[PDB]
């Protein structure tokens, strides 16, 4: 409380010093010289506890921390020096925590356009740890986003930036965070689905995630990649160029194999993708028949899981109509 007020006053003071410099541009303020990183570090730690977050919010923690992140990004840009990367990481982690389950904070952070642009820009940092933090913030912000937040997230180009980021990531942990954010964003509107589809090599990458080989033995990447694909497949359904990319990477074959999974999320995602792709395309309709999709989806209609019963029934009904010749 007392220490929390002290740390936030330190951060606000530094921000004010930086805004004074920005307008005057008197030497450039360096974060090291003001011990700023230890300050956000402690605030990052405390923000994991619910009651500390409550105090932090009453002291305007979201404003101070978001504003610190923003100003450092504007001042130094995409720098590689350890101190600035670490500073931005801690700040972004605290913003992740402060936006978790907080309706007001999600909407407020989205309305801060300058900070939103700064966040999105950090996805092209060659620090994957930083990339992972930025994706985590965007994941929370896109979860149950109101009308205004949905618009803002779209306008700052967060969808394209995350998809482009995903193609370049070398670490599984960065990719988890990136795909989770995209999973949320891909459900927002048609424009967001189009932006994913329009990125060069993105659809092939997404089909690639369906057979991903996790060495942490998780299903996270298959689930989220398949989740994104399920969301965008409604757009793919009416686009022959997009269907062809899926055909070249054996997508339908994999989706059928996904109906055998023990993960209910994977089955659900597969059912939804097959639901979209079984509509209005004789070529893919025939292929699904040839692969035995009818009997496979027949097993899942009486499922106790709501989306599996619905998705599998919707797909089957699209196959029962549009019967290919025996």
């Amino acid at each position: 409380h007392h220490h929390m007020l002290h740390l936030l006053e330190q951060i606000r003071a530094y921000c004010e010093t930086c805004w004074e410099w920005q307008e005057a541009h008197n030497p450039m303020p360096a974060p090291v010289e003001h011990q700023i990183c230890p300050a956000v570090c402690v605030l990052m730690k405390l923000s994991f506890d619910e009651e500390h977050r409550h105090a932090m919010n009453e002291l305007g923690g979201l404003q101070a921390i978001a504003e610190l992140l923003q100003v450092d990004c504007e001042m130094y840009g995409l720098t590689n020096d350890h101190y600035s990367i670490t500073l931005r990481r801690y700040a972004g982690m605290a913003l992740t925590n402060l936006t978790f389950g907080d309706v007001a904070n999600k909407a407020t952070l989205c309305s801060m356009k300058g900070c939103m642009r700064a966040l999105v820009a950090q996805l092209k940092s060659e620090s994957e740890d930083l990339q992972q933090v930025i994706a985590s913030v965007l994941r929370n912000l896109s979860w149950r986003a109101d009308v205004n937040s949905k618009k803002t997230l779209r306008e700052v180009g967060s969808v394209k930036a995350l998809m482009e980021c995903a193609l370049e990531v070398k670490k599984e942990s960065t990719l988890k965070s990136v795909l989770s954010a995209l999973w949320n964003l891909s459900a927002h509107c048609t424009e967001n689905k189009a932006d994913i589809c329009a990125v060069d090599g993105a659809l092939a990458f997404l089909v690639g995630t369906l057979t991903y080989r996790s060495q942490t033995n998780t299903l996270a990447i298959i689930e989220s990649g398949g989740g994104i694909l399920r969301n965008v497949s409604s757009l793919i359904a009416t686009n022959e160029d997009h269907r062809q990319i899926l055909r070249e990477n054996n997508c339908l074959q994999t989706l059928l194999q996904h109906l055998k999974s023990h993960s209910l999320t994977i089955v659900s995602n597969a059912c939804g993708t097959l639901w979209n792709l079984s509509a209005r395309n004789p070529k893919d309709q025939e292929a699904l028949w040839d692969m035995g999709a009818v009997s496979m989806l027949k097993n899942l209609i009486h499922s106790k899981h709501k989306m599996i019963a619905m998705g599998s029934a919707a797909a089957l009904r699209n196959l029962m109509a549009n019967r290919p010749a025996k």
Binding site: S47, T96, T99, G101, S136, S177, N184
Partner: peptide
């Protein structure tokens, strides 16, 4: 969906 989460995955190992 991807849901929401605390910054637990970003904690240093």
């Amino acid at each position: 969906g991807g849901g929401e989460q605390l910054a637990i995955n970003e904690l240093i190992s």
